[PDB]
């Protein structure tokens, strides 16, 4: 069962974060209401001294306030935050942070970003090759609606297939066809139509000498 999602962050390790489209108007409503409260009771720069593991608000590059978690307190000027509804990370001074009211906690609305990885693909070990694959996915799917299916679990996050929402084309397969990633083979019957296939796409890419396959 493919589920509609909005892709918000692609990581340098070729993982990505998504929001569930079904809960998106609720996120927008919570953000509306949270920022209403912030405009009425403006955070004083430096009045919040953060601690590791706390939820807070943080002012992003667009000048808007978002929900965040404090991951590391390096110094008062260098607080490492994770934007819990989007999945991106940032180092900020405490002057761009404020307290998160209980009205807007993760108990009122859970963190909206969930981490996933592509099923049936190996993340390239070479940094430059990995960068090419990451850059391609960012251009392909960042800030777009996709359809997601969970394929299997892993030692880390779940591994999934993604389809472009309009065209229904398989995102991960497109990376394989472009020679940006290698196939990670799965044996299971339920995966056979998809895998043997991904392996035939890897052949298209090996023949066109694309990206990973440029030199044989």
């Amino acid at each position: 069962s493919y589920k509609p999602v909005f892709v918000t962050e692609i990581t340098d390790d070729l993982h990505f974060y998504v929001q569930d489209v079904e809960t998106g108007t609720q996120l927008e409503k919570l953000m509306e209401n949270m920022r209403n409260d912030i405009a009425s009771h403006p955070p004083v720069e430096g009045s919040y001294a953060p601690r590791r593991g706390e939820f807070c608000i943080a002012k992003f590059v667009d000048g808007e306030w978002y929900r965040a978690r404090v991951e590391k307190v390096e110094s008062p000027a260098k607080i490492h935050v994770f934007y819990i509804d989007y999945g991106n990370r940032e180092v900020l001074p405490s002057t761009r942070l404020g307290t998160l009211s209980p009205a807007f906690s993760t108990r009122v609305l859970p963190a909206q970003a969930t981490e996933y990885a592509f099923a049936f693909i190996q993340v390239p070990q070479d940094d430059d090759a990995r960068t090419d694959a990451v850059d391609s996915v960012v251009r392909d799917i960042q800030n777009t609606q996709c359809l997601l299916n969970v394929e299997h679990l892993s030692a880390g996050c779940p591994h999934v297939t993604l389809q472009f929402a309009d065209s229904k084309g398989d995102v991960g397969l497109g990376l394989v066809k472009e020679g940006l990633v290698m196939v990670e083979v799965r044996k299971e019957k339920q995966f056979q139509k998809v895998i043997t296939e991904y392996l035939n796409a890897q052949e298209s890419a090996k023949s066109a000498r694309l990206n990973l396959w440029r030199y044989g």
Binding site: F60, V61, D62, E64, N143
Partner: peptide, 4 residues
């Protein structure tokens, strides 16, 4: 949708 961005943000920027």
């Amino acid at each position: 949708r961005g943000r920027h």
